[PDB]
Amino acid sequence: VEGRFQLVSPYEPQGDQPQAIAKLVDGLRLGVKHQTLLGATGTGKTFTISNVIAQVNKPTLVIAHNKTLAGQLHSELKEFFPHNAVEYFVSYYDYYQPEAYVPQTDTYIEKDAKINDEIDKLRHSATSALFERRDVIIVASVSCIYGLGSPEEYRELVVSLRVGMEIERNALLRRLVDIQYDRNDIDFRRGTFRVRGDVVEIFPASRDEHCIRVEFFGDEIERIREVDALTGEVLGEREHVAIFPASHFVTREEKMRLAIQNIEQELEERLAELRAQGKLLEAQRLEQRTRYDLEMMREMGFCSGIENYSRHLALRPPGSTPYTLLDYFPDDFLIIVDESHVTLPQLRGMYNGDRARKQVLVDHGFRLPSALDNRPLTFEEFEQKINQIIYISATPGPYELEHSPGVVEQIIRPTGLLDPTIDVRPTKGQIDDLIGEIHERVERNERTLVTTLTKKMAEDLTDYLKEAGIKVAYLHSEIKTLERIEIIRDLRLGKYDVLVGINLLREGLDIPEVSLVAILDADKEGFLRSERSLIQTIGRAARNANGHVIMYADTITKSMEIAIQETKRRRAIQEEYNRKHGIVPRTVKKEIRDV
Template sequence: TSSLFTRRDVIVVASVSAIYGLGSPEEYRSKMVLLERGNFYDLDDVLRGLVKIQYVRNDYQLNRGTFRVRGDVLEVHPAYQDTVYRVSLFGDEVESISEVDGLTGEVLRELDVLTVYPATHFVTDEDRLAVAIKNIESEMEGRVAELQEEGKVLEAYRLRQRTMYDLEMMRELGYTSGIENYSRHLDGRPPGSTPYTLLDYFPDDYVTFVDESHITLPQITGMYKGDRSRKTTLVEFGFRLPSALDNRPLKWEEFLLKTNQLVFVSATPGPYELENSGQIVEQIIRPTGLVDPQVEVRPTKNQIDDLLNEVAKRVEHGERVLITTLTIRMAEDLTDYLLEHKVKARYMHANIETLDRIQIIRGLRTGEFDVLVGINLLREGLDLPEVTLVAILDADKEGFLRGERALIQTIGRAARNVNGRVIMYADKETDAMRAAIGETNRRREIQIAYNERNNIRPRTIQKGVSDILIAAEARGLYRTERKRAARETPRDPEELQTLIADLQAEMLAAAEDLKFEYAAKLRDEIKDLERQLQEVAS
């Protein structure tokens, strides 16, 4: 967001979370700390200014969102970047401003002006904060009275305790964990009004590219309802005030109002994109000259034996195979069957953690196994040049997993290798199959004709495995750190109790932020520590 205020050449890559609430862009912009070389400043005033925008003084370790002072040198590590700014003063005069490497201290460049934006997007001045606190207290008293009238004494007590703690933190520090749930009061917005989001930080003439729009647009439409359902539960049980409902993602209509220039990108655009696009441009030709794969339909009788034969051909040439099924059980059973027949195979479905999926993809590409069986995950975004065969089982079971768009996306996984081919196993040709095969053949004809006209010889995509390796190594490092943490668990009862209390606070904070999976992991860790505490005490 700081770059959006200071330059025009900015590309922001964001998930659908970009439509979630942020603080006011005007408040964020107005709270910056500005220093210019040659100007005079009172250092104490500068430090107070940094504290007001949620920076923390740490003279020992300079992390993001912290600053330190050593003699006449002020160093600030902005919350939004990797490098550190070093400001050298001669008395009250700014003598030099440098951008330095935070680890080595190497000077990267000299600056004339330094702008430090707030460490959080939820910053407000003292007057507005005082008004917001008063309004929050008023809402709390009203809501507590409602809960007590309904006989929800525990919920009323919980809400008062939680809110009073947050208000005390805001009075003393100007910030509290979960402050975004009070954003309506902090921004001075009326109930039900549109929240500020990342989109409000862009200039008026920005362009939005929606990648895989056939998936992303439905996600946007569903975000508001899903968020409201979760928040309503928190409000009903006294975890949050009703105003927390206004800390929400944008509704579909609000999203459209904030994005005046939209470009939808999809190999299988949905009805909305086709009906509302002023111009549709096809990008069928690939730079590598690769053409869409041939699609063959075979009967389901003896399909597994036939598939085994096709897999053996690919494995003999060091190639890989993707197989898609309809259910988790089918994927697991087929994998077991392949393993029994000496085929190196793995399965991948939604029950497998994201980082474990990355390791599985890496294993397929590096040759640890030859066949990957999946359901709905072997679609958008998977570029696997080693795959030469995609087998679609039960292709005639028309539905979500075997609709026209799903089939086209699955077929596309075989379009990264010159030997790519698709086999559909079906006893009848459904409308979805007919449409998907027809569209694939149409694109294939255009690509072949283009290659012939321009003397282009198709070549397989060359793609390294380094990006996947980094993620896999990160997963291994995470596990190592968790094991190390378990080994270094304190044996002293008092230290154990302190650690348990810290983890309980972290667990509750994670639950408040709706990070339920992380909270559940902390809960399990707490249980283990409590058992250790009992053993030590006995």
């Protein structure tokens, strides 16, 4: 009997939701490898996919393209599946810097930045949940394609305990150490064991407050319990328990013995090569560091930055396609790619940025060339890694549409909200025009979003608006992530009536109070004036019942054509729906947050 998903939702699927759910479920069951949900903004995307996953019962990875979108998806899925493992898998990349070198200012940027406890904990919780139970959803950043140690090693190395087994205390306390646990009786934290004579408490790398407690009565384990850390409050009463490695780069002793020799060989070779071409400095650097790491590995089977030796530790051919989090999932797992039209290209770029960063490190002798084999996947390897996949977007990119059997449409919102109307106006006298429209919005207690092509035009416009007597805030292209929330919330409260920015696609800009979006330079060249970018921007006024879009241009580009036409279609279909059900569109109210 399997542990299955139990979708908990106060509502039911509505709109064109049931048809989409039925379609994607039927697709996953028929055996389609690629599918694409073209969902308009305002419809329950997350909820629809939640229905799919709940109906199909597969271990699912869902990928987002930043910390924020991720976190939102985590929260949502944790609300929708409270009785199931909703997991958080990011890494360093979320807000940390990687190991790098700048051949100009001669500065080696260390990986130093301590492995943030919460994030690490969540990573281990995820990977462990992947092997422990079935009902697991894991939302992740792109980091889910980074270099990660083999799954089989992570598996077979586990300390598999059972009640009354023929084991010794010190043996166990040595096995915990082989797996990279530390004793810390004087400060019990995650990833730590504590001895008290015959009382052995272990803090799993995956847990928050729930720690394991094993003991002995001779050379045989008696009782194994789940204690609340620094409390002793008995919660569990397990008979079997498996303690997984505290690092995802731990290795067998024999394989380590061999790998070390191989590393010595590669070091000798690269050294000979460096000294051959007169790069003696680099040879010195490389020798120092490599020898240090080598000795730490000979001593305790690991060191800091052990990732850079992964390939050698895996005893795999040079240039081998690295194992990732994808491999930890079962074969028949399911992938969901949210905001695919940006997430997919971001995934694609991860290989080039990493290789460049590591190549400089190998050139100046900071690393062995094998460190290039500890890398994120290329897009092709990711393709091969896929069992089944469902892309999600309001504006699906080229790849998605190309590999999918058309699209599954979800355009009707649960509130009957329509895609906005679109006015395209000449550029001459655009500022005063927009000013008048803005005044009309202000009179109607409504908000306005304005996007310009360039920063200079943005600041000039902000100035031009302040002088008209309009409450306007400028969302700087690089402003503090916490101030973002402040200014937006203040727009919602009405401290500002308008908000000016270059990119309106950055999250948090879904505001029910916004009834007008102005797009200056709508006809100009740039990524933010593309078909898809234009539709996504148009989707910002769909949260209000009186939503309207004004594009300022002198010509009608192909992108503008396609965007306007699509919006027209969606709007027509939505009004057909509302007519057929007797729905009157009205703005979705939302409470405003604080600290």
